[PDB]
Ligand binder design. Sequence first.
Ligand SMILES: CCCC(=O)SCCNC(=O)CCNC(=O)[C@H](O)C(C)(C)COP(=O)(O)OP(=O)(O)OC[C@H]1O[C@@H](n2cnc3c(N)ncnc32)[C@H](O)[C@@H]1OP(=O)(O)O
Ligand SMILES: CCCCCCCCCCCCCCCCCC(=O)O[C@@H](COC(=O)CCCCCCCCCCCCCCC)COP(=O)(O)OCC[N+](C)(C)C
Ligand SMILES: CCCCCCCCCCCCCCCCCC(=O)O[C@@H](COC(=O)CCCCCCCCCCCCCCC)COP(=O)(O)OCC[N+](C)(C)C
Ligand SMILES: CCCCCCCCCCCCCCCCCCCC(=O)O[C@H](COC(=O)CCCCCCCCCCCCCC)COP(=O)(O)OCCN
Ligand SMILES: COC1=C(OC)C(=O)C(C/C=C(\C)CC/C=C(\C)CC/C=C(/C)CC/C=C(\C)CCC=C(C)C)=C(C)C1=O
Ligand SMILES: [Fe+3]
Ligand SMILES: [Zn+2]
Lengths: 265, 233, 249, 29, 210, 123
Amino acid sequence: MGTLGRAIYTVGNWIRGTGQALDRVGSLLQGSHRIEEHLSRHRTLMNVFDKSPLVDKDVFVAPSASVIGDVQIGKGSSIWYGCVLRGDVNNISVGSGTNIQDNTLVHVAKTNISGKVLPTLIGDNVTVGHSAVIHGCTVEDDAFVGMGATLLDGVVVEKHAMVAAGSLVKQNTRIPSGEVWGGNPAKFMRKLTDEEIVYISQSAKNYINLAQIHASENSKSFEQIEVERALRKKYARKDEDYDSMLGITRETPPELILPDNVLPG
Amino acid sequence: GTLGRAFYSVGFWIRETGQALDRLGCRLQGKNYFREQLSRHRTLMNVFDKAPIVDKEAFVAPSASVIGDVHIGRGSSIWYGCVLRGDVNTVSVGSGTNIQDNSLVHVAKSNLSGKVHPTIIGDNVTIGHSAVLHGCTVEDETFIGMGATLLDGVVVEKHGMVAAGALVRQNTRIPSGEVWGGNPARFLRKLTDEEIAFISQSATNYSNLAQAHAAENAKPLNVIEFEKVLRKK
Amino acid sequence: PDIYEGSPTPVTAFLSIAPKISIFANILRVFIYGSYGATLQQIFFFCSIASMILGALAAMAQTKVKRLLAYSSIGHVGYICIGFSCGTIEGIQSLLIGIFIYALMTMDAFAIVLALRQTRVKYIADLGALAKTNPILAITFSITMFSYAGIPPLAGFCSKFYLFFAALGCGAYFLALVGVVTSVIGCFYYIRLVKRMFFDTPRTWILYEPMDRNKSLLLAMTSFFITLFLLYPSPLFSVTHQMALSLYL
Amino acid sequence: KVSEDKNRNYAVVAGVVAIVGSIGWYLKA
Amino acid sequence: QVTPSPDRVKWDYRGQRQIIPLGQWLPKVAVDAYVAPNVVLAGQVTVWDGSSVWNGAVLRGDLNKITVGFCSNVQERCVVHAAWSSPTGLPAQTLIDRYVTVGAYSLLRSCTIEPECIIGQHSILMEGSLVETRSILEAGSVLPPGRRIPSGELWGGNPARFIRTLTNEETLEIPKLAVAINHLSGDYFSEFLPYSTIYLEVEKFKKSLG
Amino acid sequence: GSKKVSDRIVKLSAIDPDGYKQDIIGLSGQTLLRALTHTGLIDPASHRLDDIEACSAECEVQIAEEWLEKLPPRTYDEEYVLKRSSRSRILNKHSRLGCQVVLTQELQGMVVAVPEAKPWDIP
Ligand SMILES: CCCC(=O)SCCNC(=O)CCNC(=O)[C@H](O)C(C)(C)COP(=O)(O)OP(=O)(O)OC[C@H]1O[C@@H](n2cnc3c(N)ncnc32)[C@H](O)[C@@H]1OP(=O)(O)O
Ligand SMILES: CCCCCCCCCCCCCCCCCC(=O)O[C@@H](COC(=O)CCCCCCCCCCCCCCC)COP(=O)(O)OCC[N+](C)(C)C
Ligand SMILES: CCCCCCCCCCCCCCCCCC(=O)O[C@@H](COC(=O)CCCCCCCCCCCCCCC)COP(=O)(O)OCC[N+](C)(C)C
Ligand SMILES: CCCCCCCCCCCCCCCCCCCC(=O)O[C@H](COC(=O)CCCCCCCCCCCCCC)COP(=O)(O)OCCN
Ligand SMILES: COC1=C(OC)C(=O)C(C/C=C(\C)CC/C=C(\C)CC/C=C(/C)CC/C=C(\C)CCC=C(C)C)=C(C)C1=O
Ligand SMILES: [Fe+3]
Ligand SMILES: [Zn+2]
């Protein structure tokens, strides 16, 4: 503060002007070839055709996800990094406690080649694996869709049914309850054991828990990010022997401790 | 050329120095805002002089990655999450062509497996969601099913169709009017005339949908959201 | 060797250099400046030969880096004490030159060791594939090893050259034979490290964290000195001759 | 308008004094 | 009922953070590794010297560790994940060893890839699966849970099957491909200074709002 | 898929220094030390390579003679390392260096005793 503070601030202004001038000169020397980085224009939630996505309070939507148009997402659901939910020509509905994994595409159609064109309906407690493609089809509650699987228009995945990782499910195919289908084209592989039904449920609840920590981290402000960076650096290593000499016990701050429901045990 | 790269390199030295000077000036004023972790994603990215040339009438989603020498024609559209990387060779997209969400159009990263082929996409082409195109040619008015993979040297002739989830092996030629699918991709049947009509009309519909999404994205960034993010506690 | 290995590595680095300088100053000013004479030079003569032989053999036995460096230092103090033994102005000068060069080389070696302790380097075999995971670090460490071996024109060649100069100056041929044999043994166990970093293809690699600025700068300067000292060695030669003379005048 | 961290300002003055005094030390020697 | 929140962020001016810490789990990136700007690394992720992760990839270490080894590459739109446990009973971390080329659009979950392997584009490696050293998977391969690719072999298909045994020249080519991809990644690494100038844009955007 | 990890898995039991028996898992062709490090029975950081030149008997295990006959005999270097690493400088006849034991299908069901860990982290 005071006169010294003001003088140092003015000198900082001069230094900033000089630095930005040097940056401009360096840009000129590069032949202006470098496209400049800019403020991020990606919108996590966007309207189109006067349709606004309806997203429940406690839904993790990763900032890099794209939720566009007429999309409804229910309680406890999670949309992960790089997901695209494009509800522009038709409706997309996601039930409660359903996870849409990273880099997944969900889309709809305005008019199919033949039959009744239907919206994309994803039920409750559904797991959809990484990089899946869901197009104009219906996934009923407690179903599992493997990573990298493709569901074409009119496909119905029934309750407690599984689509294996990597499968290509042709248009209008029906996956009956209790069966697992896979391959390209997808076809019946075998019945689902009871332990696998329990797995599907477990998948869904584990995701519900994972979504909480990811949502908490992605929503932190600049100041909290800096505070936690400093705290993480301070507690990354230890000298418990010198602490015992000092007669103190350093405790990990609670903002660095994860909840027990996401820990391996 | 070599002189251009030398000046580009020297330019980086000057720029690095100027930005460091600016950070010093901010530090003297007690500002730490340069420490903020802000995304360095660029929708269009140059690799030295190899830069994307995009037509003014083409929609490119902000989250898409266009890297190096990539040409996009009028009325064409690059959708959300798409990646187009032409650095070792070029990638060209014709007019009225849609590249759907999460698709990947790239060339061989190295010439170890031989000369790196370019990727040529003709006019009024549909490239389905999450398709992979790797150093191939896709002629006008063809259909690439979503989730399909086309390897280098492949040629998809006009009105050809690649079924969803197909794996077209290296150097395979897809003849006109034919539907190929499966892993490996094989002849399935002939294309019907209704399918040709749907190819054209779906492409024209995508160009209109592109227009709508480009207008949506071009709207000014909301300042209320900015203030909400700034004033969080 | 036990103290050097068991102490914290910065302690080991500090003990490897400074006490030698201080105690050799003491030894010069006590014995050289005093007078019982040939008996004591014979003391240091026999201890020099024993130190060279034992250091060479024991270092050849070692599989761990710290113990290898400890035994290497024992051998080198044998080489240095040969200069004290011969009892001439050039002997004192050579002892001082050896101390200075050994100190700089030891500083280089322990800067590398401390850099590698961030990933808990312990065994010589832990250096495998270092020429792949950090090429300039593997070269720098190789220059240090070749300097330790005394390969010309690296700085380490001075101690070897004087060892044989005194062997033919004081008139001692058993000493020259011992120097030849121990120098060859030393070269073997020094180039074993270079072989481990450059020639071996282990199944499991250890990736090392890059060093901090302080150690990189110190390493850079000591590496230029080790490679380029013999291009301009005049200041050290003059200052060491000055010091040798100042003991009596 | 003003830098408020007093200790930072004092450190800035100390660095400036070191630089200028070093220049003067070289110049007058 | 779907009850929304008025305060949920629709547009985040910062974009997606590349480095997502999770408690004390902080992703570790070597100073000489290229990570594309829009990549997401979360939790227990280690990216070692000379490796590269390309546009649109996601590496999520929230259930187990993820490691990308020396001079290895994870290419565009790959997703690498891990689980608490594997059906085989072996530890379920995802280990991508040295000189490994993971083709674009590949999905990896709790798999091990031994040194000097090539994963074809659009491949899937499932829980507890193992790719032994000096092996090649063709594009579009699906490796089911706990399946193994024996060393020195070429495999492919959905599901993957033995095609042929590799020649020594072919297996010699694999680290060369990894090195060439690292050389290419150097060009991208040289385009980015240590800091961006976005904060200036944020500053003027703020000033225009008072 | 006609080639599974289950084809190479070797069932093993290890008795910890407290005496409790544990069922552990390792691959054929890999070392006993790796199998022991999978569950932390031996600290992986204490023995990072499978090489005799990087061994101070941190991998040492005790095996009964019924399984010792199914292993190759100890080499001279192995016995040297074991003897020098002994506190009493005595060679235990049932001691094996875990880094030198390669698992095979013939070692299914082998019982191994893991002694108390020796200090290994040199300052
Ligand atoms: C905590 C997180 C929870 C999550 O969200 S997990 C989501 C990410 N992970 C996934 O999506 C992977 C899901 N798992 C799969 O897809 C598995 O392939 C699936 C369907 C469980 C089958 O695995 P297994 O039971 O171990 O196979 P199986 O014993 O029934 O073998 C029968 C024959 O079928 C074949 N095969 C099985 N897996 C396949 C596949 N995905 N696709 C195609 N073909 C497959 C397999 O070759 C096997 O033998 P064969 O073909 O008759 O000779
Ligand atoms: C003749 C002497 C007696 C015999 C002893 C020989 C000892 C060496 C053994 C020879 C066999 C072959 C040795 C191969 C080494 C050559 C390769 C090499 O060292 O290249 C280094 C280069 O190492 C150096 O940095 C050497 C620097 C020494 C500087 C000495 C020159 C002093 C004046 C030059 C002024 C500046 C440059 C002027 C022009 C721009 C690259 O290091 P990396 O670990 O690969 O990567 C470094 C990281 N990065 C490239 C990103 C910066
Ligand atoms: C318009 C034409 C004028 C252009 C002038 C350009 C001149 C610039 C020349 C470059 C000088 C480089 C000096 C390098 C030292 C960096 C000083 C610094 O970083 O300032 C720091 C610390 O400053 C100091 O502690 C002492 C050094 C400051 C003295 C030199 C300041 C250089 C500009 C002079 C400004 C004062 C002039 C007016 C004084 C009344 C501010 O405090 P903190 O943010 O808490 O430091 C954090 C730690 N870290 C160092 C990593 C940033
Ligand atoms: C003779 C052969 C030829 C030699 C050629 C010599 C040529 C002159 C040397 C030119 C040097 C070029 C580099 C100059 C710019 C570097 C400036 C350093 C900036 C600095 O502040 O470094 C600080 C650390 O201190 C440091 O890192 C500096 C201390 C490093 C040790 C230097 C020696 C100090 C003790 C003297 C030992 C003498 C031994 C002799 C037996 C902070 O660095 P940071 O900001 O990156 O953060 C580090 C994280 N904590
Ligand atoms: C392999 O067979 C065996 C030996 O044989 C190498 C042995 O010894 C011993 C046991 C007996 C020993 C070790 C007594 C030797 C001890 C001595 C000489 C004490 C001195 C200590 C050291 C380290 C020797 C250093 C002294 C030297 C080199 C010379 C002295 C100084 C000058 C000439 C200046 C055993 C069991 C053995 O099984
Ligand atoms: Fe061992
Ligand atoms: Zn669609």
